[PDB]
Amino acid sequence: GLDPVKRRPGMYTDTARPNHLAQEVIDNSVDEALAGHAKQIEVTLYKDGSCEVSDDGRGMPVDIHPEEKIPGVELILTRLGVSVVNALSTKVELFIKREGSEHRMEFRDGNAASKLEVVGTVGKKNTGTRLRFWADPKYFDTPKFNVRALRHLLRAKAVLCPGLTVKLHDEATGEQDSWYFENGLRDYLKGEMAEHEMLPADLFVGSLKKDTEIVDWAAGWVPEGELVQESYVNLIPTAQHGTHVNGLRSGLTDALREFCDFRNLLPRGVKLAPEDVWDRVTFVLSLKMTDPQFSGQTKERLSSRQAAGFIEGAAHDAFSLYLNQNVEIGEKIAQIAIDRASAR
């Protein structure tokens, strides 16, 4: 039943505005992209207050449940995720392209307002899902979407999913956006820091997979300029960073320290502190792990001690190898850290 959601919307979404509802719909399309079955996602904010999210994924299920006797997609929207979107919307209309046909279903106040209809015939490779919802203003402080927050969120999806093209279309202003990063983290960070020189010039990139745990990152040392420092856990942004970031920091520090030691770069009585190594670092870090635990006054920080050791080892081994194969660049990075230490 969806009544519990209607009774206490604040327990299922952010009632300040409909951004979170859109987020839930967007996450479904991003999962298709992460599974390698989607390359295009487009979000549209309409003047009537509705929001539509369209993807070229495999498409939501259009079969009928043997027990329930209703469309599988209907069960998704009316049971227990995206069901919250439907429970808090006066209307929801979705079109699904799957198995050579385009289907349509409508909902009103969370209840099915039609059957699963065959509305078109399409090629076998033409698949995808488009879901438009009309949030019921009586549940939110305002029906208006924070477009700026949505732009950042959509861009992140393109960053975290290499090869995925994400678009935003705001009908009120007519403004259009398009994000695409063939490389993912590296292309994004390079573009954001294109105005400043850094070491390595093309960043220092690395990644490691042990199977349930996966980490990806791009980092560089910037002598001068605003630093980009963003971290994520399962595509969830951690504004307050945390254990995964501490691991990256500790790992890069250990490798650099060892480098300065072997190369005999340390001035008299000077030892590198992690702050010396981290102060001018610009980076993007993306971690994927099972059931991540968050801390902080707002859950915006990761606490998984496991994540620290995992990333520390990944960054340590990866950065040591890079430094040893790029001595000149390595000594320039070490110097940035040494200058901080000597100047402390």
- Locus of tokens 């000149």: 328
**Alpha carbon distance 9, 150 (integer Å):** 21
Residue 181's nearest CA partner among 191, 170, 194, 168 is 191
**Alpha carbon distance 154, 110 (integer Å):** 26
Structure tokens at 59: 């498409």
**Alpha carbon distance 212, 292 (integer Å):** 12
299 close to 293: Cβ distance less than 8 angstroms: no
Residue 242's nearest CA partner among 312, 285, 303 is 303
Residues near 85 by beta carbon (within 8 Å), at least 6 away in sequence? 21, 24, 25, 77, 92, 131, 133
DSSP-derived pairing of the beta strands 214-221 and 281-288: antiparallel
Documented resolution in Å = 2.2
Residues 287-314, buried b or exposed e (16+ Cβ, 10 A)?
Answer: bbbeebbbeeeeeebbbbebbbebbbbb
Binding site: what residues are annotated? Answer: 28, 55, 81-82, 299
The beta-carbon contacts of 11-17 under 8 Å, at least 24 apart in sequence, are 12/84, 12/87, 12/88, 13/84, 13/88, 15/139, 15/140, 15/141, 16/140, 16/141, 16/142, 17/140, 17/141, 17/142, 17/143, 17/144, 17/145, 17/146
In which residue ranges of the chain is CATH 3.30.230.10 found? 184-344
**Alpha carbon distance 200, 65 (integer Å):** 55
The CA distances from residue 342 to 101, 131, 150, in Å, are 68, 58, 43
What does R_g of the chain's alpha carbons equal in angstroms?
Answer: 24
Residue 308's nearest CA partner among 231, 198, 197, 236 is 231
Q: Helix 185-192 and helix 147-160: axis angle, to 10°?
A: 130
Residue 212's nearest CA partner among 136, 307, 294, 130 is 307
206 close to 314: Cβ distance less than 8 angstroms: yes
Residues near 123 by beta carbon (within 8 Å), at least 6 away in sequence? 100
Question: In CATH, which superfamily holds the domain spanning 1-183?
Answer: Histidine kinase-like ATPase, C-terminal domain (3.30.565.10)
Residues near 27 by beta carbon (within 8 Å), at least 6 away in sequence? 235
Binding site for ATP: what residues are annotated? Answer: 28, 55, 81-82, 299
Residue 267's nearest CA partner among 164, 216, 203, 343 is 343
Q: Helix 305-325 and helix 327-342: axis angle, to 10°?
A: 120
User: 261 — phi, psi (to 5°)?
Assistant: -70, -60
Q: Which CATH architecture best describes the domain 184-344?
A: 2-Layer Sandwich (3.30)
How many Å separate Cα 47 from the centre of its chain? 27
Binding site for Mg(2+): what residues are annotated? Answer: 28
Residues near 248 by beta carbon (within 8 Å), at least 6 away in sequence? 217, 219, 283, 285, 311, 312, 315
In which residue ranges of the chain is CATH 3.30.565.10 found? 1-183
**Alpha carbon distance 40, 206 (integer Å):** 26
**Alpha carbon distance 184, 42 (integer Å):** 18
SS (H, E, C) the chain: CCHHHHHCHHHCCCCCCCHHHHHHHHHHHHHHHHCCCCCEEEEEECCCCCEEEEECCCCCCCCECCCCCCEHHHHHHHCCCHHHHHHCEEEEEEEEEECCEEEEEEEECCEECCCCEEEEECCCCCCEEEEEEEECHHHCCCCCCCHHHHHHHHHHHHHHCCCCEEEEEECCCCCEEEEECCCCHHHHHHHHCCCCCCEEEEEEEEEEECCCCEEEEEEEECCCCCCCEEEEECCEECCCCEHHHHHHHHHHHHHHHHHHHHCCCCCCCCCCCHHHHHCCEEEEEEEECCCCCEECCCCCEECCHHHHHHHHHHHHHHHHHHHHHCHHHHHHHHHHHHHHHHCC
How many Å separate Cα 196 from the centre of its chain? 25
The CA distances from residue 28 to 38, 97, 216, 278, 340, in Å, are 11, 15, 22, 36, 45
120 close to 91: Cβ distance less than 8 angstroms: no
Experimental technique used? X-ray
**Alpha carbon distance 198, 221 (integer Å):** 5
DSSP-derived pairing of the beta strands 199-209 and 176-180: unpaired
